[PDB]
Ligand binder design. Structure first.
Ligand SMILES: CC(C)CCC[C@@H](C)CCC[C@@H](C)CCC[C@@H](C)CCOC[C@@H](CO[C@H]1O[C@H](CO)[C@@H](O)[C@H](O)[C@H]1O[C@H]1O[C@H](CO[C@@H]2O[C@H](CO)[C@H](O)[C@H](OS(=O)(=O)O)[C@H]2O)[C@@H](O)[C@H](O)[C@@H]1O)OCC[C@H](C)CCC[C@H](C)CCC[C@H](C)CCCC(C)C
Ligand SMILES: CC(C)CCC[C@@H](C)CCC[C@@H](C)CCC[C@@H](C)CCOC[C@@H](CO[C@H]1O[C@H](CO)[C@@H](O)[C@H](O)[C@H]1O[C@H]1O[C@H](CO[C@@H]2O[C@H](CO)[C@H](O)[C@H](OS(=O)(=O)O)[C@H]2O)[C@@H](O)[C@H](O)[C@@H]1O)OCC[C@H](C)CCC[C@H](C)CCC[C@H](C)CCCC(C)C
Ligand SMILES: CC(C)CCC[C@@H](C)CCC[C@@H](C)CCC[C@@H](C)CCOC[C@@H](CO[C@H]1O[C@H](CO)[C@@H](O)[C@H](O)[C@H]1O[C@H]1O[C@H](CO[C@@H]2O[C@H](CO)[C@H](O)[C@H](OS(=O)(=O)O)[C@H]2O)[C@@H](O)[C@H](O)[C@@H]1O)OCC[C@H](C)CCC[C@H](C)CCC[C@H](C)CCCC(C)C
Ligand code: RET
Ligand code: RET
Ligand code: RET
Ligand code: SOG
Ligand code: SOG
Ligand code: SOG
Lengths: 227, 227, 227
C-alpha cells in the first residue's frame, strides 16, 4: 500500500493473474500445433504483465527521476512489460495473417525501438528531452500501426472468412488501444502534468488489461486460431 | 581474492573455461548440420558461464542488497548467466525431441520469467517479499519440469532408441539438478540464512558445472546428436 | 553541446538518421520476400544506431567510471547499439551466404559475448581488469571473423556470381572494419590513454557510419539481395 495508486496496481496484478490462469486452463489439452502457438503467445502476454504489475505494487518496478526541478516517481516496470509483450501481440497478428519474416523482423525491430526509446524518454532528466524521445517513439508506433492496418489486412484477405474477420476485429482494437498509450503518457506525469499519477496509472491499467486479457479473449475464443 | 568464496568462483571459472575448450575442440570439423546445432548450443552454455563466473571472481558480478537490516552481498551475474543458459539447455532438449515451436516458445517464456522473477527476488529490499518472488519463480520452474518430464518423453518415444535413452538420461539429470536450485537459494544467504554464502557459492558451483559441463558431456558423447 | 565531442556525436546522429531515411525510401515497394528481409535487417541497423547516437549527444548514453584514480566518461550507449546491430550485420551475411542455423547461432552467441564482455570491460573499476575483458572480447571477435572469412566464403562460392562477389566485398569490409574497433578501444580513453576521448569518438563515428551506412549501401545497391 502507501502510494495512492497501489489499488489500480493490485487490481491490475489480480486481473493479469486470473487472465493467465484462464488462458492456461483453456489451452489445457489442445493438440493443434497452430492453436498451441496462439495459446503459448497469448498466455505468455498476461503472465509477464502479472509479474511486472506485481513489481509495481510491491514497489520494485518504481524508481524516481529528477526533472522539472523535482523528483518524479517513474514506473519503469511498465516498459519492461511492454518490451516483451508488444512483440508477442505482434507475433499473434503475424501468425494469424501469415506475414513474411522480413516484415515480422521490421515490426519487432520497430517495436523494440518504440518501447526502448519510450523508456529512455521516461528516464531522461532534462524535461525538454523527454518529448523528443516521445516523438521518436510515437513515430515508430505509427509505422507499426500503418503496416498492421494496411499490410496485414491485405494479407488476411487471403485467409478463410473466420480468420479475416477475427483479424479485422483484432486489428481495430490494437490500432485504437495502441494509439491511446502515447496520449496518456503525454498528458500524464511523465510528459505534461495535465493528469495525476493516480489517474495516469488507472488509465494504463485499463489500457493494459484490455490489450492483454481482452485481446487474448477475442482471439482465443474464435476458431481463427485453428489451422 | 579477498571474499572467502573466491576459490569456488575461480575454480568454477576454470572448469567452465576448460569445458568450453574441450567442446570447441571436439566439434572442430563436424559437418552434420544437426550435430552442429547441438554443438553450437551446448558449447555456448559454458562459454557464457565462463564469462559470468569470471565476473564474480573479479568482483564485477557482485553487488550489495539491503534487507533484514543489513547489506547482503548478492551475485547478480548468476542470474545473467542463467538467463541465457537455461533457454539453451531447453533448446538442446527440444531439438533432441523435435518439440513443437509452440511448446518451445512456452518453455522459453516460462524460463525467462523464472530467471527474471528470480533475479527480482534476489534484489528485493523487503525481506518478506524475496520469498514471494521465489514462489513465483519456483512455480514457473515446476511448469518447465512438468512439460520436460511428460511432454518431451512422449515426444522422444517416437525417435530411434539412441535418441530415446539419451533424452531419458538428460531428462533425469535436468529434473534433479534444476530442482536443487530453488532449494539452495531458499537455504542460502538470499532466503533463509541457514547456510553461509561460502557454502551457498560452492553448491551453485557444483550445480552449475554439472548442469553445463556434465550435461554437455552426456549429450555430446552420444550418437543421439546425429540426424 | 558542452562535451568537446558533441559535434562528432551530432554528426553521427545526422548520418545514421539520413542513412535510415534513404534505406527506408529505397525499400518502399519491394515485393521480393528475400529482398525484404535484406532491407528490414539493413534498415534496422542505422535506425538503432540513430537512437543510440542521439542518446550520446543528449547525454543519456554517457556515464562516469572510476579507474586509474579518476572518473572517466564512458559512453555505454555505444555497446547497447553494437549489442543489437552487430548480430543483424551477421544475419545479412548469413542470409546472403545461406548459412546453417547452427553456425548462425554460434556467431550470434559469439557476438553477444563479444559486446557484452566488451561492455563489462568498459565499466570495470580496476584498470588492470579492463584489459582482461578486452582480450576475451577480442578473442570472440577473431572467432567471428575467422568463420566469416573462411566458412562463409566457401558457402558463397555455391551462389551465383553476383552473390559471390558482393559477399567478397562485404566480407573484406567487415574484417577490416571490425578489427579496427578493439584497436581504437585499446588506444582510446577506455584502455591506454594514448588518444583523447575527442578523437576516440571521431574514430568510432567514422567506423560506425561506414559499417552501418556504407555496408548497407554496398549490399542494398547490388542485385545480390534478390532471390
Ligand atoms: C530482448 C529485447 C528485445 C531487448 C532489450 C534491451 C536491453 C537488453 C539492453 C539495454 C543495453 C545494455 C546492454 C546497456 C546497459 C549498460 C548499463 C551500465 C547502463 C544502464 O543505465 C541505462 C538505463 C538508465 O538507468 C537510469 O535510471 C535509473 C533508475 O531511475 C537510475 O538509477 C540511473 O542512474 C539512470 O542512469 C542514467 O542517468 C545517469 C545520470 O547520472 C548523473 O545524474 C545526476 C542527477 O541525478 C546528473 O545529471 C549527472 O550529471 S553530471 O553532474 O555528472 O554532469 C549524471 O551523470 C547517467 O550517468 C547514465 O548514463 C544514464 O543516462 O536505461 C536503459 C535504456 C534502454 C533499455 C537502452 C536503449 C535501448 C534501444 C532503444 C534498444 C533497441 C532494441 C531493438 C529491440 C533491436 C532488436 C534486434 C533483433 C536482434 C532483431
Ligand atoms: C534476452 C532475455 C531473454 C530477456 C532479458 C530481460 C532484460 C532485457 C530487461 C529488463 C528490462 C529493462 C528494459 C528495464 C530497465 C530500466 C532501468 C532503468 C531500471 C533498472 O533497475 C532494475 C534492476 C534493479 O536494479 C537494482 O539492483 C542494483 C544492484 O544491487 C541497485 O544498484 C539498484 O539501485 C536496484 O534498483 C531497484 O531499487 C531501487 C531502490 O532505490 C531506493 O533504495 C533505498 C534503499 O537503498 C530505498 O528503498 C528507496 O525507497 S524510498 O526511500 O525512496 O522510499 C528506494 O527508492 C528502485 O528505485 C528501483 O526501481 C529498483 O527497484 O532489476 C532488473 C530486474 C529484471 C531483469 C526485470 C524484470 C524482467 C521480467 C521477469 C522478464 C520476462 C522476460 C521473458 C524472457 C519474455 C520473452 C518474450 C519473447 C519475445 C518470446
Ligand atoms: C538481447 C541481447 C542479445 C542480450 C543482452 C544482455 C542483457 C539482456 C542482460 C544483462 C543481465 C541482467 C538480467 C542482470 C542485471 C542485474 C542488475 C541489477 C545489475 C546491473 O548492473 C550491471 C551493469 C553495471 O552497472 C555498472 O555501470 C553503471 C554506470 O556507469 C553504474 O552506475 C553501476 O553502479 C555499475 O555497477 C557495477 O559496479 C557496482 C559497484 O558498486 C560499488 O562501487 C564502488 C566505487 O564506485 C566500490 O567499488 C564498491 O566496492 S566496495 O567498497 O563495496 O567494496 C562497489 O561495490 C557493483 O556493485 C555492481 O555489481 C556492478 O559491478 O553491467 C551489465 C553488463 C552486461 C550487459 C552483463 C553480462 C552479459 C553477458 C556477457 C551476455 C551474453 C549474452 C549472449 C547474447 C547469449 C545469447 C543466447 C541466445 C538465447 C542464443
Ligand atoms: C502491454 C500491452 C500493450 C498493447 C502495450 C502497448 C504500448 C504502447 C503502444 C506504448 C507506446 C508509447 C509511445 C508511442 C510513445 C510514449 C511512450 C510509450 C512507450 C508509452
Ligand atoms: C546454469 C545452468 C542451469 C541448469 C541453471 C538452472 C537454474 C535454475 C533452475 C534456477 C531456478 C530458481 C528458482 C526455481 C527459484 C529461486 C531462484 C532461482 C533463479 C535460483
Ligand atoms: C555498429 C557496427 C559495427 C560493425 C560494430 C562493431 C563492433 C565491434 C567489432 C566491437 C568489438 C570490441 C572488441 C573486439 C574488444 C574491445 C571492445 C569492443 C566492443 C569495442
Ligand atoms: C509462470 C509460467 C507461465 C507459463 C505460461 C506458458 C504459456 C503456456 S500455453 C500452453 O503451452 C503448451 C505447450 O507447452 C500447449 O500445448 C498448450 O495448448 C498451451 O495452452
Ligand atoms: C568466445 C566465443 C565462443 C564461441 C563458441 C561458439 C560455439 C561454436 S560451436 C561450433 O560451431 C560451428 C559453426 O560455426 C560448427 O560447425 C562446429 O561443429 C561447432 O563445434
Ligand atoms: C523507427 C522505426 C524504424 C523501422 C525501420 C524498419 C525497417 C523496415 S524495412 C521495410 O520493411 C517492409 C516490411 O514491413 C518491407 O516490405 C520493405 O521492402 C522494407 O524496406
Amino acid at each position: 500500500t502507501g502510494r495512492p495508486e497501489w489499488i489500480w496496481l493490485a487490481l491490475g496484478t489480480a486481473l493479469m493473474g486470473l487472465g493467465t490462469l484462464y488462458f492456461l486452463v483453456k489451452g489445457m489439452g489442445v493438440s493443434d500445433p497452430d492453436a498451441k502457438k496462439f495459446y503459448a503467445i497469448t498466455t505468455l502476454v498476461p503472465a509477464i504483465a502479472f509479474t511486472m504489475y506485481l513489481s509495481m505494487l510491491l514497489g520494485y518496478g518504481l524508481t524516481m527521476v529528477p526533472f522539472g526541478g523535482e523528483q518524479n516517481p517513474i514506473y519503469w516496470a511498465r516498459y519492461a512489460d511492454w518490451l516483451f509483450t508488444t512483440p508477442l501481440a505482434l507475433l499473434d497478428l503475424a501468425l494469424l495473417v501469415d506475414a513474411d519474416q522480413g516484415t515480422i523482423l521490421a515490426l519487432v525491430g520497430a517495436d523494440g525501438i518504440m518501447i526502448g526509446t519510450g523508456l529512455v524518454g521516461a528516464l531522461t532528466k532534462v524535461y525538454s528531452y523527454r518529448f523528443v524521445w516521445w516523438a521518436i517513439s510515437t513515430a515508430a508506433m505509427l509505422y507499426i500501426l500503418y503496416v498492421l492496418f494496411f499490410g496485414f489486412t491485405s494479407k488476411a484477405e487471403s485467409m478463410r472468412p473466420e480468420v479475416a474477420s477475427t483479424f479485422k476485429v483484432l486489428r481495430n482494437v490494437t490500432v485504437v488501444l495502441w494509439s491511446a498509450y502515447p496520449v496518456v503518457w503525454l498528458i500524464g506525469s511523465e510528459g505534461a502534468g495535465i493528469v495525476p499519477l493516480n489517474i495516469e496509472t488507472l488509465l494504463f491499467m485499463v489500457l493494459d488489461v484490455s490489450a492483454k486479457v481482452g485481446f487474448g479473449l477475442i482471439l482465443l475464443r474464435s476458431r481463427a486460431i485453428f489451422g
